[PDB]
């Protein structure tokens, strides 16, 4: 059933699994019309499909053309997500197909279950974890490839860069979730922390800066301070 704090190590075992987050699939700007009514304009979105053990990110870019002449877009967006995840699984060799797919939002369960009826041995699960994958579009290189797309495109990233050379998957996921939570809570402050020292750069083939082990501990502390600072600002506590 549902994935929580009770079964957290399960993420880093040898059973292939993917998280699917649909929160950036259908994205709009709300604006006034000439007549003073309100309209939406869609912008490019993405499915965030992540293997938490390997760091492999299947970023399916959703181009605005897929919404053209469609109705009930927030509903269609869940079914298009499920269609694309189903297509991704069918495209993988059998030994690379996941045994489990965890959806970050319960509204994805029925669409994904219906698209995956051909895969009765793939478990479709919700999670009790509050994951900050909505902040993926705060990673400059991911935002750039989504906004520049002129057509539907899949791009493959490793969201952990080379961290698994030095740290376990558990620790890499913990670092990723802390970085994304900070970017979600105060994007400007998080990006300032990550980029404020010019001597530490982002390699061309990486998403995050090239921090030494000691520098990552400092960064991690500054991110925890940001989240606590923002929590004190929110609640006046």
């Amino acid at each position: 059933g549902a994935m929580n704090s009770s079964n957290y190590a399960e993420l880093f075992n040898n059973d292939i699994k993917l998280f699917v987050d649909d929160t950036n699939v259908y994205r709009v700007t709300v604006h006034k019309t000439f007549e003073g009514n309100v309209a939406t304009k869609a912008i490019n979105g993405c499915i965030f499909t992540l293997n938490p053990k390997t760091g492999h990110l299947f970023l399916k870019i959703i181009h605005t053309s897929v919404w053209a002449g469609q109705k009930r877009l927030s509903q269609l967006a869940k079914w298009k997500t499920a269609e694309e995840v189903s297509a991704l699984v069918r495209s993988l060799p059998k030994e690379e197909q996941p045994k489990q797919i965890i959806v970050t939002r319960k509204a994805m369960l029925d669409p994904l279950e219906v698209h995956m009826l051909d895969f009765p041995n793939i478990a479709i699960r919700p999670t009790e974890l509050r994951l900050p994958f909505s902040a993926a579009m705060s990673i400059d290189k991911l935002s750039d490839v989504v906004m520049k797309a002129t057509e539907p495109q899949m791009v493959l990233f490793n969201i952990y860069d080379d961290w698994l050379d030095r740290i376990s998957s558990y620790t890499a996921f913990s670092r990723l979730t802390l970085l994304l939570r900070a970017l979600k809570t105060n994007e400007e402050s998080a990006k300032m922390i990550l980029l404020s020292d010019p001597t530490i750069t982002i390699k061309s083939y990486h998403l995050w800066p090239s921090f030494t082990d000691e520098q990552w501990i400092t960064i991690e502390s500054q991110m925890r301070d940001l989240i606590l600072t923002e929590y004190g600002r929110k609640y006046n506590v």
Binding site: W79, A82, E83, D110, P111, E113, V114, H115, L117, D118
Partner: protein, 300 residues
């Protein structure tokens, strides 16, 4: 007017005949039920006074043979049997009638309730859902599971209702996942009506049979089947006008007959709220919506 004689009544029992019920005392001179209307299926059903566990009963049609009830003290139940000797049977029934040892099927002349609950129910379709081919009558009880319940255990004692499953390859055409999940017309019209039932009459017969087993025996699998067959129609955008109007009538009489005190165990809140207030057919079931809102406003 046909007759189901009883050899005797050695154990105190509540006897059901269709929607009617009679208490019989241990060793009371009860010798059966007369004046049973020809033209309908009937159900004769039992709840023992000393163990209310197991409601059980027999679906029969007096046009197909001469049936009687005889208590079996080994298996501890009232059993239906067929009498093949016409003249012996006629002679037994005449003697019990002459001695007024039979209760009369107590039908009011104005009262179409049983017709209205059984309009589409045919003995030949009951005998395919309840498989015991050596008898012309069908045994059902409280505990019998459905083929679908046994998938999710003894197959010979199962209720073989048509399996309905909204998240199955049968329900969902490859490439029409969202369309077929959110609008079940394909599943209703092509798969179930054209494919399996052949016509709306057989579909309604199964729905009505499922309701009556749910009501008379408290058969949980029957209750699931009745709701699934309602939900399949209400969840289809495209349904023939004649099927919607007939479904409204069917459900009206079912809701009218249901004892008020059993509504909490026999009616699924989710299915009825969805069918009446959210579904494609939310405005197609006028009679049913009105009786539900007046009789069971709590559920909604």
């Amino acid at each position: 007017m046909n007759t189901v004689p009883f050899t005797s009544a050695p154990i105190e029992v509540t006897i059901g005949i269709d929607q009617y019920s009679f208490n019989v005392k241990e060793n009371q001179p009860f010798h059966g039920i007369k004046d049973i209307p020809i033209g309908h299926v009937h159900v004769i059903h039992f709840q023992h006074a000393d163990n209310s566990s197991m409601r059980y009963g027999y679906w029969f049609d007096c046009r197909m043979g001469n049936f009687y009830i005889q208590y079996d003290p080994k298996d501890g139940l009232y059993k239906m049997m067929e009498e093949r000797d016409g003249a012996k049977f006629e002679n037994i029934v005449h003697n019990f009638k002459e001695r007024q040892m039979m209760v009369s099927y107590p039908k009011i002349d104005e009262d179409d309730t049983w017709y209205n609950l059984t309009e589409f129910v045919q003995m030949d379709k009951i005998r395919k859902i309840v498989r015991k081919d050596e008898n012309q009558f069908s045994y059902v009880d409280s505990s019998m599971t459905t083929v679908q319940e046994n998938e999710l255990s003894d197959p010979a004692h199962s209720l073989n209702y048509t399996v309905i499953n909204f998240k199955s390859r049968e329900a969902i055409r490859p490439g029409h996942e969202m369309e077929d999940f959110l609008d079940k017309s394909y599943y209703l019209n092509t798969v179930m009506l054209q494919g399996i039932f052949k016509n709306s009459s057989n579909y309604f017969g199964e729905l009505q049979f499922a309701f009556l087993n749910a009501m008379f025996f408290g058969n949980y699998g029957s209750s699931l089947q009745w709701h699934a067959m309602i939900e399949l129609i209400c969840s289809s955008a495209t349904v023939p006008k004649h099927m919607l109007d007939k479904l409204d009538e069917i459900l009206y009489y079912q809701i009218k007959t249901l004892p008020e005190q059993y509504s909490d165990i026999l009616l699924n809140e989710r299915v009825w709220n969805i069918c009446l207030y959210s579904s494609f057919q939310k405005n197609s079931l006028h009679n049913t919506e009105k009786i539900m809102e007046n009789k069971y406003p709590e559920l909604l």
